[PDB]
From a paper:
To gain insight into the catalytic mechanism of RhGmaS, the crystal structure of apo-RhGmaS was solved. There are three monomers arranged as a trimer in an asymmetric unit, with each monomer composed of 15 α-helices and 13 β-strands. During structural refinement, we could not find the electron densities of the N-terminal His-tag, suggesting that this tag is flexible.
Sequence analysis indicates that GmaS is closely related to, but distinct from, the glutamine synthetase (GS) family, one of the oldest and most ubiquitously existing families of enzymes in biota. However, gel filtration analysis demonstrated that RhGmaS is a dodecamer in solution, which is consistent with the result of electron microscopic analysis.
Author numbering:
A (entry chain C), B (entry chain C): 1 to 291, 301 to 430
The structure:
Amino acid sequence: MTDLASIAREKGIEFFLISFTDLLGVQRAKLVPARAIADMAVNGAGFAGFAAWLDMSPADADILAIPDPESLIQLPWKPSVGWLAADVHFEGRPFPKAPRVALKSVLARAAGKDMHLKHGVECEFFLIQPDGSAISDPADTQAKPCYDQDALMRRFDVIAEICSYMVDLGWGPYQNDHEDANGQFEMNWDYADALVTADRHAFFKFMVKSVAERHGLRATFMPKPFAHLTGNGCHTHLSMWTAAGDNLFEGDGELGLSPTAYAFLGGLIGHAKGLTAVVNPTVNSYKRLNASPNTITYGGNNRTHMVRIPDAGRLELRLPDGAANPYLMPAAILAAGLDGIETQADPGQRLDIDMYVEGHSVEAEQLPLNLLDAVRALEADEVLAGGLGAAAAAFAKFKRAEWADYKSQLTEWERRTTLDC
Amino acid sequence: MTDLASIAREKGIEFFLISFTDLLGVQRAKLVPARAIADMAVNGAGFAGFAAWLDMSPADADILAIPDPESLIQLPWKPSVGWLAADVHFEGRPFPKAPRVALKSVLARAAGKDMHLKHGVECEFFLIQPDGSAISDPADTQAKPCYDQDALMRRFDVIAEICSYMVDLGWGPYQNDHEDANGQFEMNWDYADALVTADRHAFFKFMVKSVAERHGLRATFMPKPFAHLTGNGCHTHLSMWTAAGDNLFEGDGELGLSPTAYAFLGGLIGHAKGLTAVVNPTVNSYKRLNASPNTITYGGNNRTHMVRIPDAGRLELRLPDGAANPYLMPAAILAAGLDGIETQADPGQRLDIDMYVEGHSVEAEQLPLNLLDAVRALEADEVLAGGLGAAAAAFAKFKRAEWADYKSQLTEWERRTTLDC
């Protein structure tokens, strides 16, 4: 197609943002003027990977980040800037420690079996005061705030703005909601090819953060930003397709699922523990797993299990929180799912229970309850560790560092509880 | 001898404090007038153990705390109050979950082999502002404050007072020091029969806390009370004796130790991990083990190993911190030591290294680095768990609760590091 330089001329783009996601979900970007896009579209932009979360050294050569021209997004709030998602290349080949590179690998394995992952994201977020002390709306205070029309329309301006951008960009948004915590929201768009979805996820986090700042607010995807309120989820909708456009998950077993889906499901259940460290990747993530419901169970149309079946041909994975890496998250679910399929794994009986009331009477395999045990879990699950490749160890290394960091902090809790021993 | 009522008349005691130490080292006491001492000396004082750290229920009968008349201490700063240490009795028998009861059990086992434990305590403590924000002396600020004559004599009044009390009570004190952190002190008295020492430890913590308050200050034994300073140790000096007054630890092997001592030592090294949860019993304890030196090694005249040999017939155990239970600490070291002796256990080679410089090159068995792993360690070491009896599980239960408590706190560290994911 027409080179990025040519688009830059027709559509009036003055600068490109060349962007990649590192192991921690941090967006690293670089701002290049149009007069330079041509050269980089082809050779990529040069960063020093040791400065980002990539487990590299100062002595290594600068990595090259090659833009995916198919990913261009003209910032709807600032049209002269062109945003681009990029693969980090190192010494010729794509760098297997960058998340988009790892996602694209797992996809290629699945591809060569005529299996195509498609997923949707439920990115919840709070809107907060710029200084982070409190939610953005002091009038949002009732016990059960969910779907509060009052508080919802109080933030219409910023919501509507971002939703309309999504309409224009073609993501096909269909709903905007106030969620179950004061100050918390969700905006939903259509499911798509994993890679498409992933980019959209990385960009959505940027847009909402960016737009909210322009309205003198702040967006946070943090798992548990307030001691007194529920946290941010990032539940995921999954479906496997053939190139021929057929839903491999749709079938005639129970609930409308095929045997293939139930092996995929078995894969999830099989790797739930190590999978946990990846979609609950921060010390803060583990407040949510210590409310009650930390047990490994599906499913059915029921919001009380680690997995839900909403409809024929779909699994909802109610495990990942807001801190989830947009590329590392699909990547790792895919790994565990392809295993389910390749080892014809057994999910076990369904359970139509409400686990909040009747989950104590069920004997159930339990998820890890803190980062360290979670990392330990990922480190032992070699099937998983292999599906992500060199990334897995890098991740584990960083998160073991973060653990130590958090544990070295002197809390008021320590001093209140121990000053008197 | 003359009943406590008679002493009360000669020595002018108006009230008795009947005291016991619970699983957390908390001193539970009760204030009884002299007119009532007679009855309680014999039947004990009635508390409801469910209200203290004893793993009991409201439905249980009130425990009885029988004073040990041999332990009387007339508060040197308030002579009309008589302090007494007590065994918690429950339903006839001594309650095996109370620390003094557990210490006295292990001692009785050792006793029936003509083995008598004797130990000294190095109780370090900071003096702080009453509100706990800072050390008590703003003029104590140099890099290497240890043995600072200036700052030492700046707190002469309160030190000298407490030291002189110890002279009068017969504990045989021999030195008072400013320790290696700003605001931190140590006062040393003679070693003695474990049980004697233990009471003296429980009372020392009370006296220093009490006297310092009378001087408008505050004492803390907390492991790590300040982010910027070193912590409180509670190193212990150990020696085994026969009734005939002979030091079973004194011999002709290396360094002047007998084979018996080296099996005891082996016992320690053998149970170091599970022993850790007991003498490092708080979430706060684990800052000190994550400075560098968390490795299981003795020894010799060297302050870099988990164990030190200062002289013929003595082991110094450099493992316990200020939060250590005065009864649970001897109790548990004794257990691990009697095992060493009964299984003729092997400590391994000595190592005359400085572990701060040359400890990374040694392959060494590593202690647990956080409360939970520590509790796990104690739970698996059944030899140890058996030597303390019913206490061990109670302890483990409480500390697993404390862990959850600490992990449920929302720190500023979480919010600074995660608000932006």
